[PDB]
């Protein structure tokens, strides 16, 4: 909102400063830029942005009082290049003049903020996310960063919450109105890249409150999101993730038109530096419109999947007495003994990449059959892709329960997540 001295935003096929201070912004040819305000820095020498701050109005203060915010998406390590990922630090944003200033740096799974004052004194603060989680909230997924500086503290906030704090009471004058160079710099593979959006600078130390608000505003969209935080799309192959059953995936049971639930395979080598669960497993689903290709809250869809090259569909049986029942997975058909219409929902009021899938009788029927989920059926105990009436009450309970088994995320293949072995 207020105190914004740089505000890099997409406009008319270009990246511009909308702060009102009219910084000069030069995007070189190697930066990929789109109207979702996303830009990509690659390993190419022409993949850079030069921002020249207006030297007159912006001023270096005696003591630090300034903040930087942006969204970032950092690809997964390569399994065959773990050590290079762990060890090789590369600058992504550099803002120096007369050997003083600031930079943003990455070393594998660590993001690093660094200050150098006019006397050559340096201080750093970093945020590092775990690379041994079954399912990471951070790896190759859009998240929100804010760094704040005053005379006492450099802090990093992730997704609105304080993560790191360095004492910088020994830091004196920092020259912070130098050229800002957005460019990958250091010992990086040909393949390395970074995505960023909504890069902004403030001439104050932002409050936690101010940052949390910014997180929510910038999180907002009418459209739903995929697992990576990109817009959810019609007519796109997606694997399915369950936020309440993180390690579970859907597979058509052999010679039976139901979806059994199996346990995700993991990274199969012994390498004690990393661990992850495979994401590109289970049926390949695809969302179709019932009636752009962006999925919005309240849209009516078919949830389909590929059985070899045939396109099958997810149904609920019209007659079900129990609280929970298995879904029917079968060819596209008009049969009036099964509901085929789903309304995609977003019941969470906080930022999320999860959505819910609500079965209805038709597009105008006010009645609600239930939400798609996972349930343990006693036959042997065994988990199945299901519909459940039970979620209908749960989804109204505030605050919204993040870990309900009715919470789904859609995972497309992405160049920033490889898991071949």
């Amino acid at each position: 909102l207020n105190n914004i001295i740089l505000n890099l935003r997409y406009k008319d096929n270009n990246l511009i400063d909308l702060s009102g201070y009219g910084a000069k912004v030069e995007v070189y040819d190697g930066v990929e830029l789109n109207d979702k305000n996303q830009f990509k820095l690659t390993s190419s020498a022409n993949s850079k942005i030069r921002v020249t701050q207006n030297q007159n109005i912006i001023f270096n203060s005696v003591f630090l009082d300034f903040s930087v915010s942006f969204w970032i998406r950092i690809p997964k390590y390569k399994n065959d290049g773990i050590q290079n990922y762990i060890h090789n630090e590369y600058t992504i944003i550099n803002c120096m003049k007369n050997n003083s200033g600031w930079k943003i740096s990455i070393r594998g799974n660590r993001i690093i903020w660094t200050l150098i004052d006019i006397n050559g004194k340096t201080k750093s603060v970093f945020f590092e996310y775990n690379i041994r989680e079954d399912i990471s909230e951070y790896i190759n997924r859009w998240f929100f960063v804010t760094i704040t500086n005053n005379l006492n503290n450099a802090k990093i906030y992730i997704n609105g919450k304080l993560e790191s704090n360095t004492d910088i009471k020994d830091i004196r004058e920092v020259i912070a109105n130098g050229e800002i160079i957005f460019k990958l710099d250091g010992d990086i593979d040909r393949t390395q890249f970074i995505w960023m959006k909504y890069f902004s600078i403030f001439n104050t130390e932002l409050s936690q409150s101010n940052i949390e608000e910014r997180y929510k505003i910038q999180s907002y969209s009418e459209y739903l999101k995929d697992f990576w935080g990109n817009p959810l799309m019609y007519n796109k192959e997606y694997y399915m993730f369950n936020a309440g059953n993180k390690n579970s995936y859907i597979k058509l049971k052999k010679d039976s038109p139901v979806g059994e639930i199996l346990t995700r395979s993991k990274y199969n080598q012994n390498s004690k530096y990393i661990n992850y669960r495979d994401l590109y497993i289970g049926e390949k689903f695809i969302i179709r419109r019932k009636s752009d290709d962006i999925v919005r809250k309240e849209d009516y869809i078919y949830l389909d999947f590929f059985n070899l090259n045939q396109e099958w569909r997810v149904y609920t049986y019209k007659y079900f007495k129990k609280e929970e029942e298995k879904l029917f997975l079968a060819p596209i058909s008009d049969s009036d003994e099964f509901y085929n219409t789903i309304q995609i929902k977003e019941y969470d009021e906080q930022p999320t990449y999860s959505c819910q899938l609500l079965f209805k009788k038709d597009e105008e029927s006010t009645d609600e059959i239930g939400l798609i989920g996972i349930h343990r059926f006693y036959e042997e105990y065994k988990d199945y892709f299901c519909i459940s009436k039970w979620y209908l009450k749960e989804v109204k309970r505030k605050p919204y329960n993040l870990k309900l088994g009715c919470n789904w995320q859609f995972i497309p293949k992405d160049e920033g997540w490889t898991e071949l072995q």
């Binding site: 038109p257 029917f328 003994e337």
Partner: peptide
């Protein structure tokens, strides 16, 4: 057709 034959399997799954 495939659909009605699968429906029969599904009825076993329902425990009907």
């Amino acid at each position: 057709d495939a659909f009605s034959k699968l429906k029969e399997k599904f009825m076993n799954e329902l425990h009907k």
